[PDB]
Nucleic acid binder design. Structure first.
Length: 383
RNA sequence: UGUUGUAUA
């Protein structure tokens, strides 16, 4: 199916091939893996005369290039390094097809490039086509990237229109694999008023017997939205969001997705929020350290809480008993809590580390017999 | 020895 020229260029002939030599073959080269990189490289150091010759061979069938696995890079080159007249002619071929391209695996790259480098009257013409289909775009595996592009670099008036389509479905779209990222970009990149309205929407609604925010923090996708809502909420709303988190801390530290929201607060939140999380953990360090999910939260607590809060959690482990065992001994033998013991050794202050080593000392000579306890021994060979 | 989400050769 390939021309002789393309086949030979692929098979190492013409090591000095120039743009002018492949006249009449631009469309075929563009739809070829190596023909496309050739045109892209050659365009970079090509004269305006050459670039225009290339452009005339792709303009008619430009759409076909936009939806091609290899040709879409060529279209993108002209949207970024072509003449004003070339950018505008390509925008004309796009007119009436923006939606199809934004829904397309390669077309959506071309749309984002066009939105970034064509003039304003053409950006607004292109965005006008999209505003009629925001609902579909927000949930599409490719269109969601085009919506996020507008939110990150578009003009405020256009961001506001995207917020209006999301205004009302924050809870549902936050649980959507593709749309949850758009909710994030709205929360981070829209106006102050629009961010507060979106955050307030889930603050004021209930999901049956659950608070909407609690549901979101348990969701595989919406937990990322809440983390962003925590990062950008103004102080008054932030306290409202955090109140839902604190009320459900015990549930969330044991949840497969909620435990990351708790850790996010421990690593990047305010210290008094960490102090309240620690106060819920206190008295349950033994049990939570043995939990697949909560054990990670216990680790973040001793790492990021205050000096005395960490000391309290470590001292609890040192002083509490598990039936006839010391809690430390039970923790060392557990598949998860052994990691907590190791982290506690690492972060303890020398005086407290000595107390930890004292409770560990009777067991050193027999840790090798334990599936997980032996990793305490392995670690201790650095102390 | 232990847990989270979409981008092109």
């Amino acid at each position: 199916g390939r021309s002789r020229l393309l086949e030979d260029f692929r098979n190492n002939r013409y090591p000095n091939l120039q743009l002018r030599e492949i006249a009449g073959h631009i469309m075929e080269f563009s739809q070829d893996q190596h023909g496309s990189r050739f045109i892209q490289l050659k365009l970079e150091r090509a004269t305006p005369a050459e670039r225009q010759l290339v452009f005339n061979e792709i303009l008619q069938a430009a759409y076909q290039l936009m939806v091609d696995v290899f040709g879409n890079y060529v279209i993108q080159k002209f949207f970024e390094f072509g003449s004003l007249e070339q950018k505008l002619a390509l925008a004309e071929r796009i007119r009436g097809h923006v939606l199809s391209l934004a829904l397309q695996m390669y077309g959506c790259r071309v749309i984002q490039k066009a939105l970034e480098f064509i003039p304003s009257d053409q950006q607004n013409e292109m965005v006008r086509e999209l505003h009629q289909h925001t609902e579909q775009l927000v949930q599409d595996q490719y269109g969601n990237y085009v919506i996020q592009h507008v939110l990150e670099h578009g003009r405020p008036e256009d961001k506001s229109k995207i917020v209006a389509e999301i205004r009302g479905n924050v809870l549902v779209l936050s649980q959507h694999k593709f749309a949850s990222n758009v909710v994030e970009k709205c929360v981070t990149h829209a106006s102050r008023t629009e961010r507060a309205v979106l955050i307030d929407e889930v603050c004021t609604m209930n999901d049956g017997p659950h608070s909407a925010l609690y549901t979101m923090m348990k969701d595989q996708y919406a937990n990322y939205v809440v983390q962003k809502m925590i990062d950008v909420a103004e102080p008054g709303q932030r306290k409202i969001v955090m109140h839902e988190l604190h009320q459900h801390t015990e549930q969330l530290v044991q949840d497969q997705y909620g435990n990351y929201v708790i850790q996010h607060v421990l690593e990047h939140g305010r210290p008094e929020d960490k102090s309240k999380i620690v106060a819920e953990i206190r008295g349950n360090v033994l049990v939570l350290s043995q939990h697949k999910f909560a054990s990670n939260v216990v680790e973040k607590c001793v790492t990021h809480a205050s000096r005395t809060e960490r000391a309290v959690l470590i001292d609890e482990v040192c002083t509490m008993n598990d039936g006839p065992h010391s809690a430390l001994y039970t923790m060392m033998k557990d598949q998860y809590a052994n990691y907590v013991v190791q982290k506690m050794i690492d972060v303890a202050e020398p005086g407290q580390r000595k107390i930890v080593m004292h409770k560990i000392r009777p067991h050193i000579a027999t840790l090798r017999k334990y599936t997980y306890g032996k990793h305490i021994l392995a670690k201790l060979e650095k102390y």
